[PDB]
Amino acid sequence: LPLPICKQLFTDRQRSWWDAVYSLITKKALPGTSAKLRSVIQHDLTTLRAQEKHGLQPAVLVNWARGLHKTGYSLNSFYDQKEYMGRCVHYWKKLLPLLDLVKQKKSIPEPVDPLFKHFHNKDIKVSEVKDLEDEACIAFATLDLVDGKTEDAIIAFESVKNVVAYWNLAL
Amino acid sequence: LEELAFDRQSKSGHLLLTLSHGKQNFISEIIETFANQCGQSILLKFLFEDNLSMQDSFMGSDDISYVENRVPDLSELSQHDNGSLRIHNGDLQHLTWLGLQWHFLSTLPPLRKWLKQIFPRVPQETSRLESNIPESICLLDLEVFLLAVVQTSYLQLQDNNTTADPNRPRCLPLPICKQLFTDRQRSWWDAVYSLITKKALPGTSAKLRSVIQHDLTTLRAQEKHGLQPAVLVNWARGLHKTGYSLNSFYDQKEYMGRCVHYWKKLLPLLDLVKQKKSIPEPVDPLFKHFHNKDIKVSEVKDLEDEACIAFATLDLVDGKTEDAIIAFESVKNVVAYWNLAL
């Protein structure tokens, strides 16, 4: 729907985090509130960086890694490609231990108040785990290619045996 | 006939530059002295003694008086060299001889252009430097091979020339020039050439792959490579100069990436030299060790600084401009200040 008649698209916690970041970076924060704003930011920044006990649903990490891979691959700047691929690979490395839990049919821990709501219709199926492991390996090989380790990248792509890996090998 | 003409012009032009010893008026002095009927009669006597008369000889009846005072141009010679490669079909003796001619001129041989002409289907670089599979060979593996062959041939010519006549040409013409490379270097190059060009005899391909796989570990500086440090320095320098001269971002990145790879393999050997430890020499090395080029403890710092410059240049080519600035500011050398200014 149009913005005036569209319901709130985000949670009050997502609002409180974004408004705290915006107010701190733009220096628009009210005098004396800056300590409270820093505490709100510091708490939920651990979640965004997938630090210990982040409580993220795996489907969010997959979407971040894919979004960053596509954006990074479309950039003509070596330094920008390296930063986006480096951050894409970071989320894949945080996702792999959760895919092992899904393969073991173990439940993923859900926070009582999550920064991003869990949607059970997007829970990763045991059948999709292999394709995501192969996609993680492709992203690792692409980072080694962007780092100029062409030989390590060739060996890594040859190991995945997928159309996307053959395309990168051809290139 | 056009390929023969390119071969003649390449060979004759490099030999004119070799025979002049850098004397500016040398071609003019020769024309005045010998480009006449008396000079022809002297040439005939040197070649055939009294067996042929001036009338019974092609040389004696030919007109040599219309000779231009033309010094061979280096840009024209580079074009003629690219033509000559078609007739020799990637012969290692021919490639090493041309590489030595350019090395005696203090100029880097255009090995990249030559290798693209001989091996048009081979990728420039590989993402799998840790692989020793023969099918993983890239143009940069062939370029470092040729750079080391040319350097080892040059050192072998110097050590043999310390007692030679000052008028002796630094490099002899190909027909009378001794083998510039070892039979192992031959066996490796001919195996690579035969495998890539699909000219290998039926049933020999397994043996050729084993020869390639063994010595490819040496070229990539894998575990126990047995290379002399001076060869790694020459590769890193050659690749740095070639890569810096290229206008293509992707080519610069591949050459700088491979340059940095050899510097990273050299640093632990420089630590051994600093500790006054001997470097392990193989019983049968792909590249001979020359003790006159062993790295001195005094030169280790300048090579550590050169390695740091090459790392900062790779971070600059990767678009990490801030990391490159910090790295160049740390070296405190004229080359680093020049890169900072740029």
Side-chain angles (χ1 to χ4, degrees):
Chain A
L1 293 175
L3 273 166
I5 68 171
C6 195
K7 294 184 179 180
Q8 193 173 305
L9 293 170
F10 55 75
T11 71
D12 295 331
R13 187 168 176 180
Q14 290 167 346
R15 191 190 283 281
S16 184
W17 185 83
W18 182 265
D19 290 349
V21 171
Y22 182 87
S23 296
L24 187 68
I25 296 175
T26 65
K27 306 183 179 185
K28 291 180 179 175
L30 266 78
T33 66
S34 316
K36 184 181 177 184
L37 298 180
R38 282 186 185 92
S39 301
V40 173
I41 294 168
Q42 177 172 27
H43 182 276
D44 287 341
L45 185 60
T46 67
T47 308
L48 288 172
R49 296 188 177 171
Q51 296 186 353
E52 297 185 0
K53 306 178 181 175
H54 54 71
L56 294 171
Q57 191 185 10
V60 178
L61 292 173
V62 174
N63 182 55
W64 290 345
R66 282 176 179 170
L68 294 178
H69 185 72
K70 287 181 176 189
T71 299
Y73 194 85
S74 75
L75 293 170
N76 295 4
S77 170
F78 168 85
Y79 293 105
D80 295 319
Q81 287 186 341
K82 181 170 174 145
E83 287 177 354
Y84 272 82
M85 290 314 88
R87 186 66 84 117
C88 174
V89 165
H90 174 79
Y91 294 124
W92 281 123
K93 286 179 179 182
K94 298 294 184 176
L95 177 61
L96 289 170
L98 304 175
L99 297 181
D100 282 323
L101 292 173
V102 174
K103 190 175 187 168
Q104 293 173 27
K105 303 181 179 179
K106 290 176 177 167
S107 58
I108 301 182
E110 186 175 358
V112 179
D113 180 40
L115 182 64
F116 304 111
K117 294 179 182 171
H118 287 222
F119 291 92
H120 298 304
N121 65 2
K122 295 305 183 184
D123 285 338
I124 298 179
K125 297 175 187 166
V126 183
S127 52
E128 297 165 357
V129 172
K130 188 189 172 197
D131 303 335
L132 293 173
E133 286 172 347
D134 291 342
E135 193 180 3
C137 289
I138 289 162
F140 300 163
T142 305
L143 177 63
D144 282 316
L145 181 63
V146 173
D147 273 341
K149 302 182 205 149
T150 49
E151 197 60 23
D152 295 330
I154 288 163
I155 296 167
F157 286 126
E158 286 177 356
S159 80
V160 181
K161 300 186 179 187
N162 181 322
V163 178
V164 181
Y166 303 142
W167 177 252
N168 282 284
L169 286 164
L171 288 178
Chain B
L1 289 177
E2 192 185 355
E3 287 174 1
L4 281 175
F6 280 123
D7 183 60
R8 180 188 66 225
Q9 286 181 325
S10 168
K11 285 170 177 165
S12 306
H14 282 298
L15 287 169
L16 285 167
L17 295 180
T18 300
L19 292 172
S20 75
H21 293 272
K23 292 178 182 182
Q24 294 294 334
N25 296 344
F26 179 69
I27 290 174
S28 315
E29 290 171 6
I30 291 161
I31 290 167
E32 290 176 7
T33 306
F34 290 96
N36 61 60
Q37 194 178 10
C38 297
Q40 287 181 324
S41 301
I42 293 165
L43 278 170
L44 193 76
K45 285 178 180 187
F46 280 132
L47 291 169
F48 306 116
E49 297 162 27
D50 295 317
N51 292 338
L52 292 181
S53 87
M54 282 291 287
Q55 294 185 352
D56 303 313
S57 179
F58 171 72
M59 181 178 291
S61 68
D62 192 46
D63 188 358
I64 78 169
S65 66
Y66 295 97
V67 175
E68 294 179 357
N69 185 22
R70 188 178 182 195
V71 188
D73 174 64
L74 296 183
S75 85
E76 291 185 14
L77 285 176
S78 190
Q79 295 177 21
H80 298 154
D81 291 351
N82 296 313
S84 176
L85 291 175
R86 294 192 286 269
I87 192 164
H88 295 295
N89 283 287
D91 171 50
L92 185 60
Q93 184 74 5
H94 182 254
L95 285 169
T96 306
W97 183 87
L98 287 179
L100 284 172
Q101 298 303 342
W102 286 100
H103 195 84
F104 285 120
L105 299 171
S106 309
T107 298
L108 276 167
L111 296 181
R112 185 183 180 240
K113 291 183 180 176
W114 302 349
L115 288 172
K116 283 186 177 197
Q117 187 178 4
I118 298 165
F119 301 113
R121 297 183 181 177
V122 176
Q124 189 167 286
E125 190 51 289
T126 183
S127 57
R128 299 184 182 186
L129 294 176
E130 303 303 336
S131 171
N132 66 3
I133 301 171
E135 292 74 12
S136 74
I137 286 171
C138 67
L139 297 178
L140 286 174
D141 298 320
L142 305 180
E143 188 168 346
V144 299
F145 176 86
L146 289 180
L147 285 172
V149 176
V150 172
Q151 186 187 10
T152 55
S153 307
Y154 171 82
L155 295 172
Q156 186 173 325
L157 286 173
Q158 287 191 330
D159 288 344
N160 289 317
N161 282 352
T162 43
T163 57
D165 183 338
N167 307 283
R168 185 175 173 232
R170 295 182 179 183
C171 195
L172 293 175
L174 273 166
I176 68 171
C177 195
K178 294 184 180 180
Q179 192 173 305
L180 293 170
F181 55 75
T182 71
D183 295 331
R184 187 168 176 180
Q185 289 167 346
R186 191 190 283 281
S187 184
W188 185 83
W189 182 265
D190 290 349
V192 171
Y193 182 87
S194 296
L195 187 69
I196 296 175
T197 65
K198 306 183 179 185
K199 291 180 179 175
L201 266 78
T204 66
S205 316
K207 184 181 177 184
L208 298 180
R209 282 186 185 92
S210 300
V211 173
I212 294 168
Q213 177 172 27
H214 182 276
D215 287 341
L216 185 60
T217 66
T218 308
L219 288 172
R220 296 188 177 172
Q222 296 186 353
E223 297 185 0
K224 306 178 182 175
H225 54 71
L227 294 172
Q228 191 185 10
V231 178
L232 292 173
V233 174
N234 182 55
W235 290 345
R237 282 176 179 170
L239 294 178
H240 185 72
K241 287 181 176 189
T242 299
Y244 194 85
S245 75
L246 293 170
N247 295 4
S248 170
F249 168 85
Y250 293 105
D251 295 319
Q252 287 186 341
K253 181 170 174 145
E254 287 177 354
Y255 272 82
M256 290 314 88
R258 186 66 84 117
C259 174
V260 165
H261 174 79
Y262 294 124
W263 281 123
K264 286 179 178 182
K265 298 294 184 176
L266 177 62
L267 289 170
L269 303 175
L270 297 181
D271 282 323
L272 292 173
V273 174
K274 190 175 187 168
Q275 293 173 27
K276 303 181 179 179
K277 290 176 177 167
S278 58
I279 301 182
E281 186 175 358
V283 179
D284 180 40
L286 182 64
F287 304 111
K288 294 179 182 171
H289 287 222
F290 291 92
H291 298 304
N292 65 1
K293 295 305 183 184
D294 285 338
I295 298 179
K296 297 175 187 166
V297 182
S298 53
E299 297 165 357
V300 172
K301 188 189 172 197
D302 303 335
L303 293 174
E304 286 172 347
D305 291 342
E306 193 180 3
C308 289
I309 289 162
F311 300 163
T313 305
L314 177 63
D315 282 316
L316 181 63
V317 173
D318 273 341
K320 302 182 205 149
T321 49
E322 197 60 23
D323 295 330
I325 288 163
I326 296 167
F328 286 126
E329 286 177 356
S330 80
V331 181
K332 300 186 179 187
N333 181 322
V334 178
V335 181
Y337 303 142
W338 177 252
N339 282 284
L340 286 164
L342 288 178

